[PDB]
Design an enzyme around this catalytic site. Structure first.
Site, short mmCIF file in Angstrom:
data_model
loop_
_atom_site.label_atom_id
_atom_site.label_comp_id
_atom_site.label_asym_id
_atom_site.label_seq_id
_atom_site.Cartn_x
_atom_site.Cartn_y
_atom_site.Cartn_z
N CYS B 110 0.90 -1.07 0.08
CA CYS B 110 -0.01 0.00 0.09
C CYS B 110 0.80 1.14 -0.11
O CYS B 110 1.50 1.40 0.88
CB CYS B 110 -0.94 -0.01 1.21
SG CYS B 110 -1.93 1.47 1.25
N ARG B 113 0.13 4.65 2.97
CA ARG B 113 0.08 4.55 4.24
C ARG B 113 0.56 5.61 5.03
O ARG B 113 0.55 5.35 6.39
CB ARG B 113 1.06 3.23 4.46
CG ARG B 113 0.38 2.04 4.38
CD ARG B 113 1.49 0.84 4.62
NE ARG B 113 2.42 0.68 3.58
CZ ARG B 113 3.58 0.15 3.63
NH1 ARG B 113 3.93 -0.58 4.78
NH2 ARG B 113 4.10 -0.05 2.36
N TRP B 282 -9.25 6.33 -0.69
CA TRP B 282 -9.69 7.22 -2.09
C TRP B 282 -8.25 6.49 -2.91
O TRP B 282 -7.46 6.22 -2.72
CB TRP B 282 -9.37 8.68 -1.73
CG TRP B 282 -8.21 9.28 -1.21
CD1 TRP B 282 -6.82 9.39 -1.75
CD2 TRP B 282 -8.04 9.62 0.21
NE1 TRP B 282 -6.07 9.83 -0.81
CE2 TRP B 282 -6.98 9.96 0.33
CE3 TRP B 282 -8.86 9.65 1.33
CZ2 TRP B 282 -6.11 10.56 1.64
CZ3 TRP B 282 -8.31 9.90 2.81
CH2 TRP B 282 -7.16 10.53 2.70
N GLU B 287 -4.82 3.80 -10.89
CA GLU B 287 -5.70 2.50 -10.61
C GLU B 287 -6.82 2.56 -11.83
O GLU B 287 -6.98 1.48 -12.26
CB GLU B 287 -6.38 2.69 -9.19
CG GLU B 287 -5.14 2.40 -8.10
CD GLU B 287 -5.84 2.62 -6.77
OE1 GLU B 287 -6.40 1.56 -6.55
OE2 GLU B 287 -5.98 3.52 -6.26
C1 HEM Z 1 -6.56 6.65 1.85
C2 HEM Z 1 -5.60 6.63 0.50
C3 HEM Z 1 -5.25 5.10 0.20
C4 HEM Z 1 -4.55 5.27 -1.01
C5 HEM Z 1 -4.21 6.56 -1.91
C6 HEM Z 1 -3.98 3.99 -1.26
C7 HEM Z 1 -3.20 3.55 -2.41
C8 HEM Z 1 -3.21 1.97 -2.60
C9 HEM Z 1 -3.10 1.39 -4.10
C10 HEM Z 1 -2.84 2.46 -5.21
C11 HEM Z 1 -2.80 0.16 -3.96
C12 HEM Z 1 -2.70 -0.84 -4.90
C13 HEM Z 1 -4.17 -1.37 -5.20
C14 HEM Z 1 -4.16 -2.19 -6.62
O1 HEM Z 1 -3.43 -2.18 -7.52
O2 HEM Z 1 -5.24 -3.13 -6.75
C15 HEM Z 1 -3.24 -0.07 -2.53
C16 HEM Z 1 -3.19 -1.51 -2.06
C17 HEM Z 1 -3.53 -1.90 -0.56
N1 HEM Z 1 -4.13 -0.98 0.26
FE1 HEM Z 1 -3.91 1.17 0.24
N2 HEM Z 1 -4.59 3.05 -0.13
C18 HEM Z 1 -5.35 3.94 0.63
C19 HEM Z 1 -5.97 3.33 1.80
C20 HEM Z 1 -5.92 2.27 2.29
C21 HEM Z 1 -6.43 1.83 3.44
C22 HEM Z 1 -7.59 2.99 4.11
C23 HEM Z 1 -6.21 0.63 3.91
C24 HEM Z 1 -6.92 -0.28 4.94
C25 HEM Z 1 -7.49 -0.08 5.88
C26 HEM Z 1 -5.22 0.13 2.81
C27 HEM Z 1 -4.81 -1.08 2.62
C28 HEM Z 1 -4.30 -1.58 1.50
C29 HEM Z 1 -4.07 -2.92 1.20
C30 HEM Z 1 -4.05 -4.17 2.05
C31 HEM Z 1 -3.70 -2.84 -0.36
C32 HEM Z 1 -3.10 -4.25 -1.06
C33 HEM Z 1 -4.58 -4.95 -1.55
C34 HEM Z 1 -4.19 -6.03 -2.51
O3 HEM Z 1 -3.33 -6.95 -2.01
O4 HEM Z 1 -5.12 -6.21 -3.16
N3 HEM Z 1 -5.23 0.97 1.97
N4 HEM Z 1 -3.48 1.25 -1.86
C1 LIG Z 2 -4.54 -7.98 -8.03
N1 LIG Z 2 -5.67 -6.75 -8.48
C2 LIG Z 2 -7.03 -7.07 -7.78
C3 LIG Z 2 -7.73 -6.37 -8.70
C4 LIG Z 2 -8.21 -6.27 -9.84
C5 LIG Z 2 -9.24 -5.59 -10.64
C6 LIG Z 2 -9.66 -4.63 -9.77
C7 LIG Z 2 -9.35 -4.46 -8.62
C8 LIG Z 2 -10.09 -3.45 -7.80
C9 LIG Z 2 -11.35 -2.80 -8.07
N2 LIG Z 2 -12.14 -1.85 -7.72
C10 LIG Z 2 -11.51 -1.01 -6.41
C11 LIG Z 2 -10.12 -1.44 -6.15
C12 LIG Z 2 -9.48 -0.57 -5.13
C13 LIG Z 2 -8.16 -0.94 -4.53
C14 LIG Z 2 -7.79 0.10 -3.63
C15 LIG Z 2 -8.07 0.12 -2.31
C16 LIG Z 2 -7.97 0.84 -1.32
C17 LIG Z 2 -8.31 0.87 0.12
C18 LIG Z 2 -7.48 2.19 -1.63
C19 LIG Z 2 -7.18 2.45 -2.97
N3 LIG Z 2 -6.68 3.53 -3.50
N4 LIG Z 2 -7.18 1.30 -3.85
C20 LIG Z 2 -9.35 -2.65 -6.74
C21 LIG Z 2 -8.43 -5.13 -7.82
#
Ligand code: HEM
Ligand SMILES: CNCc1cccc(-c2cncc(CCc3cc(C)cc(N)n3)c2)c1
Ligand code: HEM
Ligand SMILES: CNCc1cccc(-c2cncc(CCc3cc(C)cc(N)n3)c2)c1
Ligand SMILES: C[C@H](O)[C@H](O)[C@H]1CNc2nc(N)[nH]c(=O)c2N1
Ligand SMILES: C[C@H](O)[C@H](O)[C@H]1CNc2nc(N)[nH]c(=O)c2N1
Ligand SMILES: [Zn+2]
Lengths: 413, 411
Positions: B110, B113, B282, B287
Site C-alpha cells: 500500500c 500508508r 481514496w 488505478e
Molecule cells: C486513503 C488513501 C489510500 C490510498 C491512496 C491507497 C493506495 C493504494 C493503492 C494504489 C494500492 C494498489 C491497489 C491495486 O493495485 O489493486 C493499494 C493497495 C492496498 N491498500 Fe491502500 N490506499 C489507501 C488506503 C488504504 C486503507 C484505508 C487501507 C486499509 C485500512 C489500505 C490497505 C491496502 C491493502 C491491504 C492493499 C493491498 C491490497 C491487495 O493486495 O489487493 N489502503 N493502496
Molecule cells: C490484483 N488486483 C486485484 C484487482 C483487480 C481488478 C480490480 C481491482 C479493484 C477494483 N476496485 C477497487 C479497487 C481498490 C484498490 C484500492 C483500495 C484502497 C483501500 C485504496 C485504493 N486507492 N485502492 C481494486 C482489484
C-alpha cells in the site's frame, strides 16, 4: 526446493512450470523472512574449483550431445590434472564461446535475451598490456557498431589468477559522457560521471568541458596501474536528437551515442573469473529517453521540454511530466530510426521477451527473470511483462558485479 | 541482521531493524525470489492462539507506554484465562482499533500508508444477520464517501469461530461493475467480473445488462448461505470522465465510482481472524486510468482513444499507446477534481510514501514495502519510489488474502 514451480500471466491466464530453478547454485539475498527483490546489489582455491569446472563441463558436453563420451571424460581428466598442477585451467575456445552465450542467456535482469545465441565472441586472452587492451576494444567498438547496423559482441580478456594481476576496464561502460561539477554546485554534462571524470582528469586527461564529451578509456592490464586512451572519434557513432513534430526539439542540443557497452562486470565460467569482459548490444529507447535524459540525477530535461511544450506545470496532476516524457522518447526512437541506427522500442522488446521466455520454459524448463529490472521505466502495465509472474534465481555461467577498481587497486606509482 | 536500503536518486541510506520482528513467511528462499508472484502460499488451537495474543498485547501495551505494567500483566492473565476456558478471546475496543490501524500500517503493498493513523474504525462485531451486514456497509459507504470528501474507514464483522460460521462479503470490492458474456462473442461491462456476475444472476439478481451496472452485495453472515442486497443508488457516487482539452472524450461514455473499497481480505489481530472487514480510502488516478481502463483484460480502451486522437497506430515505436495512456489519465484526474471527489495523482502519492518511509525508519526502525506493487503502472522512474530500495517482510496485525467463498461454501 519443490520439483515444480508455476508462474501465471494475469492478462492471458497462461501458466508455465519451472523446473530449471532446481539447477540453481548461487544465493538470491532473500530468505523465508525477507525479500530483497528490489535491492540493487544484494582468490579461489583448487578445492572449490574442480566441482565448478566439472559442473560446467557436464553442461557443455550435454549441450553438444556428447555427455559421457570419451571426449567428455578425457576433458574432465585433462582439466583435473591441470587444476591440481597449476591451481587453475584454461578453457577451449568452444567452451569460452558457449560460456559467454550462456552467461547472457542466464542474465535475469536483461530483457534483450531473445538474441542470446547470436553473440560475437572476441577471444582476447592473449592480451598482455593496456595498449593491447585498447586495440582489442577499438576493434570491438568498430565491429559492434557496423555503421549503425549494430551487432552484439563481447571481448574477453585474461582470467583472474591470484587477484593481484587483474585485467580491468575502469570505465563502467565503453562509451559515456563526462560530467563536471561546477564551483556553484551546478553540473555540466552527465552528473552521474563526475567522480570517474575526475579520476580521468587526474590521470592526465585534458577535458574539453562540454556537455557531451566522450570519456577516455582507462585500462588496467595484469594488475598494473591503468592507462588513458582516447577512442578514435570516427569510431564513436552518435545520434543528434530531434522530434518528428516539434522543430524546437533539436535546439535542445541533445545527442547520444549509439553503442551500449557494459564494461565493469565479471564473467564467471566454470569457476574461472573474467574480470574484464566488455559486452555490447543495441539500445532500448527508454534507456536514453527515460533514464539518461529524465532521471533527476542525470541530464534531467523534463523541465525545459515541458516549458517548450507549454504544459501546465503548476500542478503535478496535469501530468506534465508524463506528457513530456512520452515526447522525449518519441524523439529518441525517431532520431535513431532516421539515422538508421539500431534501436528497439519498449513495446517491441517486452513482447519479444515474453515469446523468448515461453520458448525457454518449453525447451529449457525455465527462464530466470528479475521483474524489477525487466519492466520498462515508463508505461509499465501497457507492456506484457508487467502482468507476467517471474521467478528470479541464479544460474552459471553468469555476469556478476564486482567492486569498483579505484576502491581496491594497489597503486604501483 | 541489520539491513541497509539505499535511494539511488538521492544516495540516502536507511537502516532497517524492524524486519527482525517479522513473523510470517515471504515465499522467497536463498535459492529463489518470488517477489513478482501475486499470491504465494482450519481453526487455530488453544496452544497456537495464546502466543499470538501475547505478542499482540505486548506491542499494544508497549505502544501506550505501559509495558510490563500491572494493567499489562492483568490483561495478559485475563486473555490467557479466556482462551483456556473458551478456546478464543475478545478484543477490547481500544485493541481492535489499534490492531486495525496497524494492519494498514503493515500493508507492504500500500502506497497510501502515510494516512494509516487516521482511520475510522466501525465495530460491527454485534452483527448477526446479512441484513445487519447490509446496514453496516451502507453506513460505511455513506461515511467514507462524505459527499466527495473521502474519509478512510473499515467495518469489522464478527471474528471466525469454528470456521463453520464465517462472515464473508462475497464481493471482492464493495463497489464494482458487472460483466456479461455475448452471443456476439464479445464482452459487455467489466470482463474481470463475468464469473461473479453470473453467481449474482444464479442467486437471483435482475441484471440490467449495461456497461456500468453496479453489482449487488452478496453477504454471508454466520456461515449461512449468502444473500443479495442492492446498495442504494444515491449512496454510490460516480464520476463521468471528460478531458480538459479533448471535447470528444465525453462521447466515449466512460464513468467510474468514487469509492475504492476492498472487501475480500482477512484481518488478523492477535491471532484472531476477521474474515469480513471491508476497508476504503481514496483513489490514486492510475488505478482507474491505467489499470481499469487500459488493461487488455479490462475495459481495454487504448485503441479507441488512440483513433480519436488520430495517432499513427501502424508502428509501436510511434508510442501511440503511451500518448493515449497519458491523456486518459489526465482526464480521470481532471474529472474527479472537477466534481470535487478526492483523488491523488501518482506523483503526489509516491512523494508522500517516501516521506512516510523516512518517518517509519526514524520512529519505528523500518517500513515493509513491496516495490513491485508500490511503483505505479505508468511513468515508473519519474516517481521517487522507483529509485528507492525497499525490503519486503510480513508483520502482524495484517491484511491477508483468503480463498474466494464460492469455492469453499457448502450450501
Ligand atoms: C486513503 C488513501 C489510500 C490510498 C491512496 C491507497 C493506495 C493504494 C493503492 C494504489 C494500492 C494498489 C491497489 C491495486 O493495485 O489493486 C493499494 C493497495 C492496498 N491498500 Fe491502500 N490506499 C489507501 C488506503 C488504504 C486503507 C484505508 C487501507 C486499509 C485500512 C489500505 C490497505 C491496502 C491493502 C491491504 C492493499 C493491498 C491490497 C491487495 O493486495 O489487493 N489502503 N493502496
Ligand atoms: C490484483 N488486483 C486485484 C484487482 C483487480 C481488478 C480490480 C481491482 C479493484 C477494483 N476496485 C477497487 C479497487 C481498490 C484498490 C484500492 C483500495 C484502497 C483501500 C485504496 C485504493 N486507492 N485502492 C481494486 C482489484
Ligand atoms: C542485443 C540487444 C540487447 C538489448 C536490447 C538489451 C537490453 C537490456 C536493457 C534495457 C538492460 C537494462 C540496462 C539498464 O537498465 O542499465 C539490460 C541489462 C543487462 N544486459 Fe542486456 N541487452 C542487449 C544485449 C545484451 C548482451 C549482448 C549482453 C551480454 C553478452 C547483455 C547482458 C546484460 C546484463 C548482464 C544486464 C544487467 C546489467 C546490470 O546489472 O547493470 N545484454 N539489457
Ligand atoms: C544501475 N544503473 C547502471 C547505469 C547507470 C547509468 C547509465 C548506465 C549505462 C550507460 N551507458 C550505457 C548503458 C548500457 C546498458 C545496456 C547494455 C547492453 C549490453 C544492452 C543494452 N540495451 N543496454 C548503461 C548504467
Ligand atoms: C505479475 C505482477 O506481480 C502483477 O502484474 C502485479 C504487478 N504490480 C502490481 N501493482 C499493483 N499496485 N497492483 C497490481 O495489481 C499489480 N500487479
Ligand atoms: C531500487 C531499484 O531496484 C532501482 O531503482 C532499479 C529499479 N529497476 C531498474 N531497472 C533497470 N532496467 N535499470 C535500473 O537501473 C533499475 N533500477
Ligand atoms: Zn525475494
Amino acid at each position: 526446493c519443490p520439483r515444480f514451480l508455476k508462474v501465471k500471466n494475469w492478462e492471458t491466464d497462461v501458466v508455465l512450470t519451472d523446473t530449471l530453478h532446481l539447477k540453481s547454485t548461487l544465493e538470491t539475498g532473500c530468505t523465508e523472512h525477507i525479500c530483497m527483490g528490489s535491492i540493487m546489489l544484494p582468490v579461489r582455491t583448487k578445492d572449490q574449483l574442480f566441482p565448478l569446472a566439472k559442473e560446467f563441463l557436464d553442461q557443455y558436453y550435454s549441450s553438444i550431445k556428447r555427455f559421457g563420451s570419451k571426449a567428455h571424460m578425457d576433458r574432465l581428466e585433462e582439466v583435473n590434472k591441470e587444476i591440481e598442477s597449476t591451481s587453475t585451467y584454461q578453457l577451449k575456445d568452444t567452451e569460452l564461446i558457449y560460456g559467454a552465450k550462456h552467461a547472457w542467456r542466464n542474465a535475469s535482469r536483461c530483457v534483450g535475451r531473445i538474441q542470446w545465441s547470436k553473440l560475437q565472441v572476441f577471444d582476447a586472452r592473449d592480451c598482455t598490456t593496456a595498449h593491447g587492451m585498447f586495440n582489442y576494444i577499438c576493434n570491438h567498438v568498430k565491429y559492434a557498431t557496423n555503421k549503425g547496423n549494430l551487432r552484439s559482441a563481447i571481448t574477453i580478456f585474461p582470467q583472474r589468477t591470484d587477484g593481484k594481476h587483474d585485467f580491468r576496464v575502469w570505465n563502467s561502460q565503453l562509451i559515456r559522457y563526462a560530467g563536471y561539477k561546477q564551483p556553484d554546485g551546478s553540473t555540466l554534462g552527465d552528473p552521474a560521471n563526475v567522480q570517474f571524470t575526475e579520476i580521468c582528469i587526474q590521470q592526465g586527461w585534458k577535458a574539453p568541458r562540454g556537455r557531451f564529451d566522450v570519456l577516455p578509456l582507462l585500462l588496467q592490464a595484469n594488475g598494473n596501474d591503468p592507462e588513458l586512451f582516447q577512442i578514435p572519434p570516427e569510431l564513436v557513432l552518435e545520434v543528434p536528437i530531434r522530434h518528428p513534430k516539434f522543430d524546437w526539439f533539436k535546439d535542445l542540443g541533445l545527442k547520444w551515442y549509439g553503442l551500449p557497452a557494459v564494461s565493469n562486470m565479471l564473467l564467471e565460467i566454470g569457476g574461472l573469473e573474467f574480470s574484464a569482459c566488455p559486452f555490447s548490444g543495441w539500445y532500448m529507447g527508454t534507456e536514453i529517453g527515460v533514464r539518461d535524459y529524465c532521471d533527476n540525477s542525470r541530464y534531467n530535461i523534463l523541465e525545459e521540454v515541458a516549458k517548450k511544450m507549454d504544459l501546465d506545470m503548476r500542478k503535478t496532476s496535469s501530468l506534465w511530466k508524463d506528457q513530456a516524457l512520452v515526447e522525449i522518447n518519441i524523439a529518441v526512437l525517431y532520431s535513431f530510426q532516421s539515422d538508421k541506427v539500431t534501436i528497439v522500442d519498449h513495446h517491441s522488446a517486452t513482447e519479444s521477451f515474453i515469446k523468448h521466455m515461453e520458448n525457454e520454459y518449453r525447451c529449457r524448463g525455465g527462464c530466470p527473470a528479475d521483474w524489477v529490472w525487466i519492466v520498462p521505466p515508463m508505461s509499465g502495465s501497457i507492456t506484457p511483462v508487467f502482468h507476467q509472474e517471474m521467478l528470479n534465481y541464479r544460474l552459471t555461467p553468469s555476469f556478476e558485479y564486482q567492486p569498483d577498481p579505484w576502491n581496491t587497486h594497489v597503486w604501483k606509482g
